[PDB]
Amino acid sequence: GSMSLQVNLLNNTFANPFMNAAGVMCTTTEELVAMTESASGSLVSKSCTPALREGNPTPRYQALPLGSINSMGLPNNGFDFYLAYAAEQHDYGKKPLFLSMSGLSMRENVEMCKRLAAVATEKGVILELNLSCQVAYDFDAMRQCLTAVSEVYPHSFGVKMPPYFDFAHFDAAAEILNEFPKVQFITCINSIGNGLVIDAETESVVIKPKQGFGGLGGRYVLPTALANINAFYRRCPGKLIFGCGGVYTGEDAFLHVLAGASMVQVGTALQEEGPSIFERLTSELLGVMAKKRYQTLDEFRGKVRTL
Amino acid sequence: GSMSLQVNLLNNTFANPFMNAAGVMCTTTEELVAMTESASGSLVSKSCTPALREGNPTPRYQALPLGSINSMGLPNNGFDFYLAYAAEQHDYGKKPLFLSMSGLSMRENVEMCKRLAAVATEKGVILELNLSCPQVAYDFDAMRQCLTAVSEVYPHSFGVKMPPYFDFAHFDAAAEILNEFPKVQFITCINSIGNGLVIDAETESVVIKPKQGFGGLGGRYVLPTALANINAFYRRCPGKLIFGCGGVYTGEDAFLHVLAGASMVQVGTALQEEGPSIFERLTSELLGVMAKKRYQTLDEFRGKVRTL
Ligand SMILES: Cc1cc2nc3c(=O)[nH]c(=O)nc-3n(C[C@H](O)[C@H](O)[C@H](O)COP(=O)(O)O)c2cc1C
Ligand SMILES: Cc1cc2nc3c(=O)[nH]c(=O)nc-3n(C[C@H](O)[C@H](O)[C@H](O)COP(=O)(O)O)c2cc1C
Ligand SMILES: O=C(O)c1[nH]c(=O)[nH]c(=O)c1[N+](=O)[O-]
Ligand SMILES: O=C(O)c1[nH]c(=O)[nH]c(=O)c1[N+](=O)[O-]
Question: After which residues is chain B broken (C to N over 2.5 A)?
Fold first, then answer.
């Protein structure tokens, strides 16, 4: 049986659906290069602000048996850096590039988008707009953010969404997203926000910022991620869903795709394993498909059976 | 060292902080009796509606390696039934009783509370008002109005069962509302992480029937969210007690709930999977944890989680 993890979307061809989750292993040149050199089908740069940010005091990330918790504080090299990477450095012959943007205000997103436009046009970098860096838990702030970006940014882009936890919210968020035809992918999900990990041995939290509260990733978040992927897969039929959350194995990735994911992003697992993980994941996902007699992702994407 | 899991709150003494989570093993008489006969410090009856509800088509619960997912649909024997249990059958000599209430409207809650009042007065049953039934607690206006309406007609302290929140803006907003109501003397954090979707890779299907497979997550999945909420509310509602609920499988998990601020610790998924004998193991495990850590009482470390 001939098989393929190839994905075609956004006027690009991807060798496989895998890419890093924004913020994981994608902050520095070396990381971006490592992601480019990896087996991943794509990569996305660390969510950027107009200027570099040191981020939060450490420890600000902690790997856990069931995932991770982090309150990084948006450390990044600043927009110029990621723009320059996209404009001059990235080898688009190897794989497409997503640039994650997380302006701390509408104005910042507008100004970065205005500059990104030309690089997107010339080089084909694709914006993933981080709406979940809060913003998308305020549907008005979300609408305004998307409106502003859509107004100034003359390309399709995607949005990185925080998880929602009820249909009213799935419906409200989809309704808004569907109002913006430039939003051509939706990445579900960012962390499950503000969990609190307590180490029983130390009787303390495990990250320093925010009294130990931080975003959960990893095994914790898989059913929430699947819920969100599928929810928006159903509710935004005009749009692609990128899955993100709880992917450690080809099998997990298979679940993302069944739920409706086109690309599958890997955060916590990648953080722990390094970009070699993509060789394992592609292999595993092919293995899963082989055992299940699938040849292409199209054959089961979004086809999760309900009862 | 002499150690105690005793908890004292709302004019009651509890042998230990453990109780079932509302909805787990507390729907029928047999279940309520078993929970009463168990080693638990307390119990709470299945969230009730004014009339019986058969709930959702099955399968509507699935135990999972990392917890559970359910969309039960509020199956319950109806308020009269739980009121009768509280009025006539429950052995208060054994342990205090909580009655979970989940009217589908403000009016329903008001009408039940009107009737619950006398029984609370007479027998000392304590209301846990479910504001997170699959959503009042994700609508702050509704929440305030609901608490106002209930507070108007219910002349007793009670607690509220909250859904998890996921940011400080919501912890603040929720806490601000709850702090407006002095009758709200405890807050139970948390109900399920709502509307997860479990997909069985083997069957390529969801695992519960209602709502296209979407359902509330419990168990290991939810512990850091539960701890976050417990602690968030513990911090923001200093005049209230927090009951922890979410992801408790061991005395160590319970120790974490208490460290985060919990007074009572509710056990849902783990209890579903192990039955009420779990309470002997949990009390034993928590005591063991405390002995190792040189704590004698829950007071000593409740809410004392160290930040960096
Ligand atoms: C250390 C770390 C940094 C992250 N940085 C970003 C980021 O910059 N932008 C973003 O949209 N998400 C960021 N995330 C969230 C991830 O992109 C992903 O949504 C989340 O971790 C769930 O995926 P996982 O379960 O594979 O970890 C970060 C997560 C981690 C753990
Ligand atoms: C089968 C089942 C039924 C439940 N029924 C109720 C209920 O009637 N009222 C309520 O407030 N919560 C209900 N819950 C939520 C639990 O009370 C608890 O908030 C949640 O499961 C998290 O606890 P856990 O991790 O120990 O399962 C139910 C949960 C399960 C799994
Ligand atoms: O703190 C982070 O960098 C972070 N952590 C996350 O888990 N998700 C994010 O979106 C972000 N962010 O700021 O873009
Ligand atoms: O569907 C349930 O019974 C259920 N399941 C939960 O996980 N939480 C609830 O509050 C409720 N409820 O209706 O009261």
Answer: 134
* Ligand 3 closest atom vs CA A267: 7
Return d(Cα A159, Cα B283) in angstroms, integer: 47
Kindly give the distance from the C-alpha atom of residue A103 to the centroid of ligand 3, in angstroms, as a whole number: 12
Show me where the domains of chain B are located: 1-55+74-192+219-308, 56-73+193-218
- Burial (CB count within 10 angstroms: exposed 0-12, middle 13-18, buried 19+), residue A100: buried
How far is Cα A124 from Cα A115, in angstroms, rounded to an integer?
Answer: 14
- Which residue's alpha carbon is nearest to atom 6 within ligand 2? B23
* CATH architecture of the region B1-55+74-192+219-308: Alpha-Beta Barrel (3.20)
Q: Position A199: which residue type?
A: D
Identify the helix (H) or strand (E) that includes residue A41. none
- The dotted CATH code for A1-55+74-191+218-307 is 3.20.20.70
Distance of alpha carbon B292 from alpha carbon B5, whole angstroms: 15
CATH 2.30.26.10 fits B56-73+193-218, yes or no: yes
Burial of B11 (0-12, 13-18, 19+ CB in 10 A): exposed
Take residue B249 and report the two structure tokens written for it: 């499988």
**CB of A188 closer than 8 Å to CB of A230:** no
A306: amino acid identity, one letter? T
- How far apart (Å, rounded) are the C-alpha atoms in residues A128 and A177? 14
- Is the CB of residue B100 below 6 angstroms from any atom belonging to ligand 4? no
Q: Which of B198, B221, B308, B269 is nearest to A195 (CA)?
A: B221
- For atom 8 of ligand 3, which residue has the closest CA? A133
Give residue for tokens 């692609």: A240
Contact predicate A103/A131, CB 8 Å: no
Nearest to B303 by CA among B259, B266, B270, B273: B259
Nearest-by-Cβ selection for B195 from A166, A192, A195: A166
Report yes or no: B15 and B38 within 8 Å, Cβ to Cβ: no
Q: Which of B101, B243, B269, B282 to mutate to test the pocket of ligand 2 (most atoms within 8 A of CB)?
A: B269
A56-73+192-217 has the same fold as A1-55+74-191+218-307: no
Q: Which CATH superfamily is domain A56-73+192-217 in?
A: Dihydroorotate Dehydrogenase A, chain A, domain 2 (2.30.26.10)
Across chain A, how many H-helices and E-strands are there?
9, 16
**Residue A273 CB neighbour total at 10 angstroms:** 15
The answer to whether A68 and A61 have CB atoms below 8 angstroms apart is yes
Q: Which two tokens stand for residue B230?
A: 């417990």
Query: What CA–CA distance (Å, rounded) separates B195 from A188?
Result: 14
Q: Residue-wise over B14-47: b if at least 16 C-beta within 10 A, else e?
A: bbbbbbbbbbbbbbeeebbbbbbebbbbbbbbbb
**Residue among B242, B246, B265 at smallest CA distance from B192:** B246
Alpha carbon distance B246, B267 (integer Å) = 7
User: Closest partner residue to B167 among A193, A230, A292, by Cβ?
Assistant: A193
